[PDB]
Design an enzyme around this catalytic site. Structure first.
Site, PDB file in Angstrom:
ATOM      1  N   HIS A  49      58.863  56.360  84.469  1.00  0.00           N
ATOM      2  CA  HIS A  49      58.295  55.631  83.354  1.00  0.00           C
ATOM      3  C   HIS A  49      57.997  56.594  82.193  1.00  0.00           C
ATOM      4  O   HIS A  49      57.204  57.534  82.353  1.00  0.00           O
ATOM      5  CB  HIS A  49      57.009  54.980  83.857  1.00  0.00           C
ATOM      6  CG  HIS A  49      56.317  54.153  82.834  1.00  0.00           C
ATOM      7  ND1 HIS A  49      55.536  54.696  81.836  1.00  0.00           N
ATOM      8  CD2 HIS A  49      56.266  52.815  82.664  1.00  0.00           C
ATOM      9  CE1 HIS A  49      55.030  53.729  81.099  1.00  0.00           C
ATOM     10  NE2 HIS A  49      55.461  52.570  81.577  1.00  0.00           N
TER      11      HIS A  49
ATOM     12  N   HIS B  96      45.845  56.324  84.015  1.00  0.00           N
ATOM     13  CA  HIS B  96      45.785  57.384  83.025  1.00  0.00           C
ATOM     14  C   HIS B  96      44.376  57.705  82.565  1.00  0.00           C
ATOM     15  O   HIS B  96      43.496  56.842  82.490  1.00  0.00           O
ATOM     16  CB  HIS B  96      46.626  56.865  81.824  1.00  0.00           C
ATOM     17  CG  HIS B  96      46.974  57.862  80.756  1.00  0.00           C
ATOM     18  ND1 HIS B  96      47.065  57.485  79.425  1.00  0.00           N
ATOM     19  CD2 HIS B  96      47.361  59.164  80.786  1.00  0.00           C
ATOM     20  CE1 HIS B  96      47.491  58.492  78.707  1.00  0.00           C
ATOM     21  NE2 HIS B  96      47.681  59.527  79.492  1.00  0.00           N
TER      22      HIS B  96
ATOM     23  N   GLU C 209      42.440  55.519  72.454  1.00  0.00           N
ATOM     24  CA  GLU C 209      43.532  54.562  72.355  1.00  0.00           C
ATOM     25  C   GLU C 209      43.063  53.191  71.926  1.00  0.00           C
ATOM     26  O   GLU C 209      42.313  52.551  72.662  1.00  0.00           O
ATOM     27  CB  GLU C 209      44.242  54.413  73.696  1.00  0.00           C
ATOM     28  CG  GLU C 209      44.870  55.675  74.258  1.00  0.00           C
ATOM     29  CD  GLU C 209      45.307  55.498  75.705  1.00  0.00           C
ATOM     30  OE1 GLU C 209      45.424  54.337  76.152  1.00  0.00           O
ATOM     31  OE2 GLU C 209      45.515  56.516  76.409  1.00  0.00           O
TER      32      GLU C 209
ATOM     33  N   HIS D 238      40.203  52.201  74.606  1.00  0.00           N
ATOM     34  CA  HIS D 238      40.048  53.088  75.743  1.00  0.00           C
ATOM     35  C   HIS D 238      39.596  54.408  75.144  1.00  0.00           C
ATOM     36  O   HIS D 238      40.369  55.092  74.466  1.00  0.00           O
ATOM     37  CB  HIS D 238      41.376  53.310  76.447  1.00  0.00           C
ATOM     38  CG  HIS D 238      41.933  52.084  77.093  1.00  0.00           C
ATOM     39  ND1 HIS D 238      43.288  51.889  77.272  1.00  0.00           N
ATOM     40  CD2 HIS D 238      41.324  50.995  77.618  1.00  0.00           C
ATOM     41  CE1 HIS D 238      43.488  50.734  77.880  1.00  0.00           C
ATOM     42  NE2 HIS D 238      42.314  50.170  78.100  1.00  0.00           N
TER      43      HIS D 238
ATOM     44  N   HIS E 264      41.970  54.432  82.903  1.00  0.00           N
ATOM     45  CA  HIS E 264      42.551  53.127  82.611  1.00  0.00           C
ATOM     46  C   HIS E 264      43.882  53.036  83.340  1.00  0.00           C
ATOM     47  O   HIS E 264      44.344  54.017  83.938  1.00  0.00           O
ATOM     48  CB  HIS E 264      42.670  52.838  81.109  1.00  0.00           C
ATOM     49  CG  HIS E 264      43.359  53.915  80.320  1.00  0.00           C
ATOM     50  ND1 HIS E 264      42.722  55.052  79.907  1.00  0.00           N
ATOM     51  CD2 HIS E 264      44.634  53.994  79.848  1.00  0.00           C
ATOM     52  CE1 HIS E 264      43.556  55.803  79.207  1.00  0.00           C
ATOM     53  NE2 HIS E 264      44.715  55.186  79.148  1.00  0.00           N
TER      54      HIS E 264
HETATM   55 FE   LIG Z   1      46.798  55.476  78.149  1.00  0.00          FE
END
Ligand SMILES: [Fe+2]
Ligand SMILES: [Fe+2]
Ligand SMILES: [Fe+2]
Ligand SMILES: [Fe+2]
Lengths: 419, 419, 419, 419
Positions: free
Chosen positions: B291, B334, B340, B356, B362
């Site tokens: 990913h 993460h 974010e 975030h 998260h």
């Molecule tokens: Fe993230």
């Protein structure tokens, strides 16, 4: 009829031949089938991984891709050479009378056939060098184009206009104007008389506008005055074959193809040919005292990797006011780490030149020293109706064989009196 | 009728209102008397001494210079604030339902009056910070313009089209498109319904296209898809005074003038407003396994002085193919050194968002983990008909008072079984 | 008698008081016992690990080390402040009449006591900011010196000569000259009349000569014209204590010591006070057409970490020839991302000033526009007998409380007629 | 039995032969007497003054220092050459059938004896160049090792596994894997059949992982997949002398010594040989539309001093999904400033290659154009069971004499129909 142009040095441009609106793919570069059934071709002027500031490429939407051609064959080099060592070094200043243009009566000679390398330095396959050539011709290129696989060309006409056909469109380049044809770009030139000019070739690098330093955001060669051709194509079959001349690793090759290479219907990118009129140069100089260093007249620079050190700079000495008070206005005596080639668009006459090699002393003559040391100083016009220029390099130029065949103060000290 | 545009991110452009051909001075920026008797005005977006790559300025040839205005007067700030410390820190993720747009029946509110700061960080006068605002309005700005003395605005409409008037021309910006209005540029916005959107404001810096690294010379947001308005003017006297709103050092001021500020007949430069359609984003991602990190979807970046570290990045999550085999396709769990902020153009609904904060854990929820860990993998369409985005910053964002008032997995470990 | 000086901006210098030849250690910096039994003391102007180009330090060979002093005690700040937020922001241009100098008859005021902060921006302990101060005094500093722990001072006298004592020697600084006293350097100033001047203070950074770009190797402020004091000492005991004033984190402190701090017999290094006469500025400008950006007159620059962006620049507008043809010679209309403080050494009078804040429109007035748009252009003398200057910053300056207490065009458009 | 490895590209590693625990000096590099009475030897891969990011060196704790050898003697070069000018330039594309491997029945040929230089560019003693070689052999090297004094080797087996002995340990390198043996490292290779492969040699520089740009922190060749050998030694006397072959300034030399050079009991450092399996490449490409530039497949890069410009890049074309909609999926037509050498691990067959020289047009053939312009597009598997690669350089490669001896579309334009 006169040509239209797009303006903006280094711009990311888009151009479609007016006859085929919408020939540029909308929102992408590689559709499965391009508008008008054209082929998409990318011309990469820089490595793919170059940062935004140096990444150069153009997408060409053409009738046939450039691959459709027969194999290249070696042709005679003529006077185009890069052997810097056939002639022994010589530090003395060299001077050239205006180079002789061949008469059409005597020999029909086109731009490629009349290409003569004067001097140069560096290695060609290594992207570190330059060459200065003189073109002497009298006939238009007919069903013949030229491209340089080794580097870029800064073309400076002196006598005779140049009508230049490129895949990106056409440019008319007259004396007192210059144009740049970058690496890989195919071009053809029509002339209108016995023609003469100068070419600064730089290996594996491109010209940029110099950072202005204190000059700021405007001045010298403003970006807006650089002109790029608008898309123009011809779908023309050529009985007997159109010939593409290739300068590859310093040697000349010829490849025949069925059609003219100028079949690009639309194109977009930031890697294109361009021209500039020297009269638009916003001249910066001293307005109180002293004499400014000639780098203040830099038009274009081909930067080396060393900060502030150029492979080759193009400098002009344009019409301007001279106003420096209590100052020796002419060029100062000088010994320089750079080689200095000097030309004259309009002591030598227009079309000739001189080469001051590295650290060889130079400066004004006795008569110029005497006159400038005595005149009552006041605002005056300088260089009106003239245009001299300099190709200066950080390498040590070496004259070629042809370049050589073609070539040609008192003490006033008062120990006891200061003032 | 629909608007025409010039294309090319960062280009050095030239534009003249079609009604006044040749309004741009030929070959210079400061004639004694400008064509059509206009005034020359320079808008400097960067220090004068910035290198070519970062030097930004535009020359405006206008009916009256911007100096002709009465003194600025302080007006009420409303919900525009930069006090990051009135609200105690909180590391928990915040989520917002679509922000409520005021009804015209209830209160007529234009774009400036409906500006609400959500979160931010940094010092305003120091050129190191950012702010995220939400605009909630329902009426067009009438005889009122706005300019930001503190920095740039990346505007992202969500509900409702924006017809934007700027000194450089007009832009129609619809949901799924974005536009940037740089520092000092005066603008006015017409709306057509209850309107909602997001704004990323960066202090003293400008957005650039990210270097592509291995992606190369093409991909992501291609330069050609960035659209700049064509020159357009109005010579309109305003009985009672036209009002210029100024965001200066985070506070709002109002200055009256006799005419509309959009009286620029011609302009040239590389410092202009612009827009971009998100659908043109050439999406790059993984095509074998694993990913890809979300930075691979970067549209625009406001670089800090630290290499590779941005003050704020604008990232999108567009329609694309998901094809990674033997891979957990959803976002990985993460913890990040960056803040974010997430928004949705078309779990929250379009027009809401989440924050975030730095190093707060998260990742996908239980149901998403379970579903993605079990599905037979095969090529699939992702994000079709949707458009989520992220404003990520290297600073630690702090929510404002208003921002706060507006807000809202099992172990499967088999110690003894690897495969 | 008149003072002698060493010349060379940034030079690594050596100086011994003439009365004590050989006071500098031969071939080393730290002998066990220094010549004449002096103490070796190092003043570090930069982190130890700075590269050669930015590493600054000086070795002082003195009678007593600077450690011999009693504890600092807080004294009243007066009008020296760094609180940029006590006064609400205001984008309007501010103007100041020549600041009022206190009469000795009324209040005896020395240079430190007459220090008033006008405006500034940034954080002091963080090395990112600046402050502009005005000094209004009428008496010499007696048994009192001053040093700035926060940054450097670029001092610009306007009315009244300054006789400055520093540990490195003495400097006489008269109007039309400037001097720089770097961080940590103790100094004392004798005045000879009601005195007024300006001070540009930069936090945690030092002034450098601007890179010349195309201007080349000579021009603007030549390195040779920067003058550094020659070593001079006094071994003077002070009954009642000599007082050392310290600006530390924006506050003022006083420490008593037994002797005068100017007991440095010899010193060597590249971190010293210096002065420069503005008349030596080799003025560069346009000599064909258009109007050059004011950065072309940069004397000294305090660089930020962003390339080409300065924290603060010192720019002068000196006597020069104006020769631009077909050009609007006065300053163009302008909106700028930088704050612009303007002063006048010899519309405001000498000793006053103006502040054009970020993006607030400015430019010539109606009468100046009219006159310059009509005059037949020809070579003329500009700024003779005058000397205006600008402190421009990339930060947004905020005026202080005191700064505030002290403070104070037609359309010609012919739509249908281009030429 | 299969070999173990340490992982981590560029890591500062420590390794001790398992038979001699604690052979690495504890807390220092140069004890008076090393553990087990070994000799400490430093191999410097970079100048001592290189910054942390580029400083490369390894400490070898060995039985005898490498100095114990007899004088080097010149041996015959065979087909290893660096004379780029014995063969006239030729811009035409060159193609090679799989190179012929000599049969053991006919001539026993080891890896060094079967080394043939194909093409190259640059100067060897100057650290600016590269060479591409093909190895054709059939016997293991017996009591013979090889080291390159001129630069690094990126070895790419095509037919036949390589068992490689180095001072740092052993590596088994099979087709579809690559390994790098850096400058100065002695190595020996055992083969198991008629063997063929490719070698990219770069002069005076080292390979690095490319900065990922927007790709971010993971992707392409992950650092963890690079494998470094674990320490292994042999204390073996060789009757008749062990022979060390040296490539020095492009020529080959032989020096006899009493023992095998692989007597390194322990070592530590960040300058080591390494290998990488191409199957681990996390492939990044386009997942919406258009065709990504091939630099997106960069594995390793030997950077030049020019930002983003490589001396030589190693690029692979691995198994992946092709999903680009409304896109011409095959390679676009192209003219490039870089030389492009292409090889095939598993139109030419595996083990052959092609050379597209600078600016020579290239692109898909007629049949490929036709097929790709017509197919209904849908997710498909590309390159499965194949592995093509490219050595691309910024220099202009020139084929050698041997390289030469070994070597071998319609218009659809509808002017009046856009859509
Ligand atoms: Fe993230
Ligand atoms: Fe010279
Ligand atoms: Fe200004
Ligand atoms: Fe290619």
């Amino acid at each position: 009829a006169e040509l239209k142009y797009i303006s903006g040095f280094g711009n990311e441009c888009s151009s479609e031949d007016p006859r085929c609106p919408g020939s540029l793919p909308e929102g992408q570069n590689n559709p499965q089938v391009c508008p008008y059934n054209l082929y998409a071709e990318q011309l990469s002027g820089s490595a793919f991984t170059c940062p935004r500031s140096t990444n150069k490429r153009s997408w060409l939407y053409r009738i046939l891709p450039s691959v459709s051609h027969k194999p290249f064959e070696s042709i005679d080099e003529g006077h185009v050479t890069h052997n810097w060592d056939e002639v022994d070094p010589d530090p003395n200043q060299l001077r050239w009378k205006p180079f002789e243009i061949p008469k059409a009566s005597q020999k029909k000679v086109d731009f490629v056939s009349g290409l003569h390398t004067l001097c140069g330095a560096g290695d060609i396959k290594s992207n570190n060098g330059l060459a200065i050539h003189i073109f002497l011709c009298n006939t238009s290129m007919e069903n013949r184009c030229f491209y340089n696989s080794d580097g870029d060309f800064l073309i400076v006409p002196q006598k005779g206009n140049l009508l230049i056909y490129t895949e990106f469109g056409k440019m008319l380049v007259q004396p007192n104007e210059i144009c740049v044809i970058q690496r890989g770009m195919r071009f053809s030139i029509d002339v209108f008389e016995e023609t003469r000019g100068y070419i600064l070739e730089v290996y594996g690098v491109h010209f940029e506008l110099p950072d202005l330093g204190p000059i700021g955001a405007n001045g010298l060669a403003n970006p807006r005055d650089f002109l790029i051709p608008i898309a123009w194509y011809e779908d023309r079959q050529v009985p007997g074959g159109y010939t593409v001349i290739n300068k590859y690793q310093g040697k000349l090759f010829a490849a025949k193809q069925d059609v003219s290479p100028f079949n690009v219907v639309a194109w977009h990118g930031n890697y294109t040919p361009y021209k500039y009129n020297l009269k638009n140069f916003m001249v910066i100089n001293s307005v109180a005292f002293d004499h400014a260093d000639p780098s203040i007249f830099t038009v274009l620079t081909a930067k080396s990797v060393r900060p502030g050190v150029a492979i080759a700079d193009f400098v002009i000495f344009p019409p301007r006011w001279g106003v420096a008070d209590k100052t020796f206005r002419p060029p100062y005596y000088h010994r320089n780490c750079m080689s200095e080639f000097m030309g004259l668009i309009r002591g030598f006459l227009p079309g000739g030149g001189s080469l001051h090699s590295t650290m060889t002393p130079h400066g004004p003559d006795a008569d110029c020293f005497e006159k400038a040391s005595k005149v009552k100083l006041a605002p005056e016009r300088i260089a009106d109706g003239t245009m001299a220029f300099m190709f200066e390099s950080s390498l040590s130029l070496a004259v070629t064989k042809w370049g050589l065949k073609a070539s040609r103060l008192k003490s006033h000290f008062t120990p006891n009196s200061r003032n």
